[model samples]
Target chain A: GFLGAAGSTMGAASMTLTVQARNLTVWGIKQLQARVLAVERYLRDQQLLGIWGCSGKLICCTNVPWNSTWSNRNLSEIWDNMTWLQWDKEISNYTQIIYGLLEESQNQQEKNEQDLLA
Target chain B: LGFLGAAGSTMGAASMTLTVQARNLLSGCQQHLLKLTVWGIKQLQARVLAVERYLRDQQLLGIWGCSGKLICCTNVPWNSTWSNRNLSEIWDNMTWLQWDKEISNYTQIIYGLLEESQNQQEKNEQ
Candidate 1:
């Protein structure tokens, strides 16, 4: 009561420090997707081929697909077209595809064995 | 006492900021590569088709060589020095080459993964 809250608050502020180190993988992935979409749009619209264009010979004058312009547009368009649900679904699909591609023969073999037993 | 404390405070803040910045850059690099890979694959797939068409319509016929005329315009200097492994048999390989099938199939799978990820991300956002 005698010292008052002003000095104590000031002193506390000087001593206060908070450091948070966040893993920015999510943002990183989002930005990466945005840029990729831009590149895709460029590829689809401009038709200009980069290293991917058969050693820079073919598809030299087409347009890029995807979407984008700059600053806000790129992020907005990318976000509009993307979502976490879709990303998770794709990851799951890829996993399933890979599993199927790799394990089909094994599954078939098992099925044959079961059939023989039956 | 005040100066020493201020110096320490600033140092801590600076270190923390730098760490966060570095983390962002590192994360950016990984995702950027994944996304770019899709674009690169797709472009290659499309270009292979176009090149095949060009070879068939021009190089194989041999009735008229566009290499000296039209190709000269688009040809890069480094490209000239590079081994034209197919310059002589451009048409032969155009009809026979199966790069389109391979690259397209590869891109389809990779892009399928990428597109699926995008859709998943959208759903999560919702």
Candidate 2:
């Protein structure tokens, strides 16, 4: 409303566009995260992703929020022996990095939104 | 049931916060949307790379990334074998080629939305 009454139309258009873009982004990102988890689920079933538990799901799937592996901050819980499986170890490392990034992405999303609320 | 309920409430609260935040950000400065988009894409790329590599190590050689580059497309042991089809197809395409294609499509769509959001943010800033 502060942009002057004559400019209100333009301001409203930008405002509408702004709101929609973020809603879509958040929705899209959540979909993408779900797919990533599904892929991780596939790998874990084959004993290739992260440490295994009794249910054969990825270790973090059973333990953390959103089954987000990064939420299980204890390293011992996320990793396993992998003494001879180089690819598996490398993957575990990359997965750790990925989940850490995922957590940061979620946090950034939350922080930006919080800033907006303020 | 108990854990499910807990998870539901947790996400509900988180979602409510984001909904509140999204409205606020949209009301004023739009750059935060761009920042969120960029970080989200980075997160996708990192996780997708891990997925890509897992596919490669398992000799699933036909995967690609959001950027149209070959995720693996090469380098397998001479004695080993590989397939263009994904594991899901065996269980489901009557599925994996289709299943894998879904992953590809989803990634592309997700990336496209973020890129557009970023472009719009740039336009808004100028």
Among these predictions, the greatest lDDT belongs to: 2
Q: Identify the leading candidate in terms of TM-score.
A: 2
Question: Model 2, which residues run further than 4 Å from truth?
Answer: A1-26, A48-118, B1-35, B60-126
lDDT (CA) per prediction: 0.35, 0.39
Candidate 2 clashing pairs, residues 3+ apart or interchain? B89-B95, B89-B96
TM-score of each: 0.16, 0.22
lDDT of 1: 0.35
Q: Compared with the true structure, what per-residue lDDT tens digits does model 1 show for residues B1-126?
A: 221233233332322222122112111154355556557557645655554564454342232222222111111122322224444343233322233443343543443444455556557789
What shift in Å separates residue A59 of candidate 1 from its native position after superposition? 20
Off by over 4 Å in 1: A1-24, A48-118, B1-95, B98-126
Please give, for residues A39-85, the per-residue lDDT of candidate 1 as tens digits. Answer: 54443322211111222332233222322221123444334455434
Error of 2 at B74 (Å): 20
How many clashes (backbone atoms < 3 Å, residues ≥3 apart in a chain or on different chains) does model 1 have?
A: 33
Residue range B81-111, candidate 2, lDDT tens digits:
2234443543333222343554553554444
